Amino acid sequence: LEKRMENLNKKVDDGFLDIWTYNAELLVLLENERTLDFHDSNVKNLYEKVKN
Amino acid sequence: GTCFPGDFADYEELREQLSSVSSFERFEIFPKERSWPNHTTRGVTAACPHAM
């Protein structure tokens, strides 16, 4: 006879997990692209320095 | 709703149970004519009218 509390607890527990999963995947897929662009920029700076 | 006044015990819990129900089968748990030999089963009230 406390089904509403059980559903509220399930709603809280299943709502936090989605947010944390989404945040983790966004963090990984943004930092990977930033790392790759940073490497390409560093190679370009060495080429410009040797040319100059 | 409740045509006769009174309190419906655990009404919201009944709503929460009936939310996830696909179907029902209405069956006669106690027959009116045979399961009460020594009582009067005829009872009417003016708080619940049907066709005047």
Ligand SMILES: *[C@@H]1O[C@H](CO)[C@@H](O)[C@H](O)[C@H]1NC(C)=O
């Ligand atoms: C009803 O009354 C009759 C007549 O006396 C009796 O035999 C019977 O035990 C009573 N109860 C039921 C449940 O029929």
